[PDB]
Amino acid sequence: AXKX
Amino acid sequence: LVPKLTASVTDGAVGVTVDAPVSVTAADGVLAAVTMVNDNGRPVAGRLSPDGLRWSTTEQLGYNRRYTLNATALGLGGAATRQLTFQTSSPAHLTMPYVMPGDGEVVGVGEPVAIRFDENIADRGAAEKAIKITTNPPVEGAFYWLNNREVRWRPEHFWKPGTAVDVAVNTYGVDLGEGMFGEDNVQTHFTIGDEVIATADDNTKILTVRVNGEVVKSMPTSMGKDSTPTANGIYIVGSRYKHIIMDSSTYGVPVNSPNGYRTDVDWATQISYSGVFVHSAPWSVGAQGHTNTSHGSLNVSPSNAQWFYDHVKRGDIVEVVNTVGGTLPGIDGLGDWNIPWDQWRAGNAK
Ligand SMILES: [Cl-]
Numbered sequence A: 001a002x003k004x
Numbered sequence B: 001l002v003p004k005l006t007a008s009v010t011d012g013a014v015g016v017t018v019d020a021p022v023s024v025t026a027a028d029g030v031l032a033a034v035t036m037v038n039d040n041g042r043p044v045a046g047r048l049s050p051d052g053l054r055w056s057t058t059e060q061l062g063y064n065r066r067y068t069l070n071a072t073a074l075g076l077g078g079a080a081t082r083q084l085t086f087q088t089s090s091p092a093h094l095t096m097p098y099v100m101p102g103d104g105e106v107v108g109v110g111e112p113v114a115i116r117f118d119e120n121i122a123d124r125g126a127a128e129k130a131i132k133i134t135t136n137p138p139v140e141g142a143f144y145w146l147n148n149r150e151v152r153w154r155p156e157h158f159w160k161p162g163t164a165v166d167v168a169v170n171t172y173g174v175d176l177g178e179g180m181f182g183e184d185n186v187q188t189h190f191t192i193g194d195e196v197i198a199t200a201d202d203n204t205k206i207l208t209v210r211v212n213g214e215v216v217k218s219m220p221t222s223m224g225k226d227s228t229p230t231a232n233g234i235y236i237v238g239s240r241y242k243h244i245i246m247d248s249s250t251y252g253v254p255v256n257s258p259n260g261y262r263t264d265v266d267w268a269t270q271i272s273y274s275g276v277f278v279h280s281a282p283w284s285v286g287a288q289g290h291t292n293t294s295h296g297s298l299n300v301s302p303s304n305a306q307w308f309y310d311h312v313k314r315g316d317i318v319e320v321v322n323t324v325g326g327t328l329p330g331i332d333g334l335g336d337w338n339i340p341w342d343q344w345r346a347g348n349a350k
Helices: B124-130 B302-311 B341-346
Strands: B004-007 B023-027 B030-038 B046-048 B054-057 B066-075 B078-087 B093-095 B097-100 B113-117 B131-136 B142-145 B150-154 B164-169 B180-182 B186-192 B196-201 B206-211 B214-220 B233-236 B240-247 B262-270 B277-280 B298-300 B317-321
Touching: B004 B066, B004 B078, B023 B030, B023 B066, B030 B046, B030 B054, B097 B164, B097 B186, B113 B164, B124 B131, B124 B150, B131 B150, B142 B341, B206 B302, B214 B302, B240 B277, B240 B302, B262 B302, B277 B302, B298 B302
Parallel strands: B093 B180, B196 B317, B277 B298
Antiparallel strands: B004 B023, B023 B054, B030 B066, B046 B054, B066 B078, B097 B113, B113 B150, B131 B164, B142 B150, B164 B186, B196 B206, B206 B214, B233 B317, B240 B262, B262 B277
16 A cells, blocks of 8 residues: 555 | 538547547538547537537546547538547546645635645646736736645735635646546636735734734734744644644644643634644743744634634735744645745746
């Protein structure tokens, strides 16, 4: 992963 | 003449973006009927123009779908019919935009328009193009990215009181690069209120609040000590808190390190992402107006901190001058105005  | 059918897509097209409706137009005749179904066979809501020359979809189109368009036209020289099948964009990822200030809010003359995406934006240009700012009275403005996810928009000078701002983030269907597409559109509106500028002067150690050029409050303050001074420059008022625990570790400084701290305080107004607040400081009342004793925050009296909370709003301005610190970074998050206009206007969409 990379959302937020 | 035989009627001619034109469409906003072509047969066999792929990557059709859903940021605009699909349309069919007739020439040398009129459209008798137009139907559009998706790959599961359900119809798509559309509307034929009164004059019968243009048909357009009326509902949001979907990602990664196959649609089949069927159009029939009539003219003096016979009828014309076409069928088209096309595929819409298939994102690798979706990103949702979050806009500040809130819809219907009244904010100070320093409030930038902020569009925070929840993913890295590879094609910053595409993002800027999808965001429409409208101002009344119209005033010039420009985009500038604070990081890979949040972009800001502001004029050259502080907003004029009474200005109405409208923001349309039309990112649904927009290819933001590397397979990233917008998840939804956002529409917000806000209004600029009174000019509120508070000046924290280290030469007098007083925080003076001016509303439309009128002095309404004078607050003794104790700012950051020489080793941890308060930086000079323009600060934008962020969030207001009836009470908050200031935690140095939020900014990367361990609480038990020499410059660390954990303090529960009242009436805290955030003016920088780096951790600067206007807050109640009953422990430094004697020092307020004489000596700097804090880690960078503006210590003021309980009553004055509460007054600040009750009478200062999001987007108002705090200007710090004559301190021994440097200048607040322009990309702090609330230091937008410390970036020269020429640099802001030039932007950094790359
Ligand atoms: Cl379906």
